[PDB]
Curated annotation (Swiss-Prot):
Binds 2 Zn(2+) ions per subunit. Belongs to the metallo-dependent hydrolases superfamily. Phosphotriesterase family. CDD domains: PTE (cd00530). This is Phosphotriesterase homology protein.
């Protein structure tokens, strides 16, 4: 059983320790091309990404899942360069990231567009998963969509359905962005269920931000896994809160439904570079191994439970294949 990766197919037994929600480069593509100074030196950016990810691999993570999609500045030829120079597995994603409306590109054709007819968004996702992204030969391993503050706008809803149908065609797992405080997981579960989606093939992201056990257990009950995936993002939820919710959930026997990450990156255009290392010093790829894991053991999370979240769960998730 294999899954596709920025360096081709790997045995799913070779996934190993997997962070289920990371990024390498995030940017608004058109702004970066037009105002390139902040990005600066392309080779330095790329080499820097390779350094950060190689370090991560040397520390004992085997795989990251990069959930950068359309709207987040996805550019796979640059990811191909990074992946070619690290032994870290990089799983790449397709889908579309919006809190509200869809790109102008979708404004004229498709369900709810000015004109319309066939959805064309789904086809684009399927092409990425099954054929490969652009000229690249790299296929997407996972689907990503979002629901935030605005909730189910017609744009957000169109994308959720496009992503649901791409998932039913290919069998690729869905990984989700949500606003946890507004409990947007429940919203996505509803749309997905209406689409006939097997909710156990869905990771609801950013549940790590929540401290509401009832909400998490309600998402699990419908079948989904939970992204405990913004470790280090302490402005949204302090270290202790993030560690406790995971600990509690393990004690309630939900380790088999949780995956971990930082939602970190090497570059994020929308924020001043020099400020973020001082305001969120723990927001990097090594925080889980340096701090979070020990703190978890301190709360009596077993080694078996950690293995489940970091190794067993991602592998199970990625071994479920084929559409329906
Ligand atoms: Zn997100
Ligand atoms: Zn993210």
């Amino acid at each position: 059983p294999e899954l596709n990766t920025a360096r081709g197919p790997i045995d799913t037994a070779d996934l190993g320790v997997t962070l289920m929600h990371e990024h390498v480069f995030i940017m608004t593509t058109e702004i970066a091309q037009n105002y390139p100074e902040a990005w600066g030196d392309e080779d330095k950016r790329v080499a820097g990404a390779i350094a950060r990810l190689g370090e991560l691999k040397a520390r004992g993570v085997d795989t990251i899942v990069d959930l950068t999609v359309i709207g987040l500045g996805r550019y796979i030829p640059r990811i191909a360069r990074v992946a070619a120079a690290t032994e870290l597995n990089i799983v790449v994603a397709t889908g579309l990231y919006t809190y509200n409306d869809v790109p102008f590109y979708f404004h004229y054709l498709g369900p709810g567009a000015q004109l319309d007819g066939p959805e064309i968004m789904t086809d684009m996702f399927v092409r990425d998963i099954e054929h490969g992204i652009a000229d690249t030969g790299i296929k997407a391993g996972i689907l990503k969509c979002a629901t935030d503050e605005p909730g189910l706008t017609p744009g957000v809803e169109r994308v959720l359905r496009a992503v649901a149908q791409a998932h039913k065609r290919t069998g690729a797992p869905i990984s989700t962005h949500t606003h946890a405080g507004l409990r947007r997981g429940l919203d996505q579960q509803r749309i997905f269920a209406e689409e006939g989606v097997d909710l156990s093939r869905v990771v609801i992201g950013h549940c790590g931000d929540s401290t509401d056990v009832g909400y998490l257990e309600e998402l699990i009950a419908a079948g989904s896994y939970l992204g405990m995936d913004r470790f280090g993002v302490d402005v949204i939820s302090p270290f202790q809160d993030r560690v406790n919710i995971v600990a509690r959930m393990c004690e309630r026997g939900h380790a088999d439904k949780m995956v971990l990450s930082h939602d970190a990156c090497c570059y994020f255009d929308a924020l001043p570079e020099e400020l973020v290392p001082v305001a969120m010093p723990n927001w990097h790829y090594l925080h889980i191994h340096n701090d979070v894991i020990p703190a978890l053991k301190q709360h009596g999370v077993t080694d078996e439970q950690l293995h489940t979240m970091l190794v067993d769960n991602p592998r199970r998730i990625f071994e479920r294949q084929g559409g329906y």
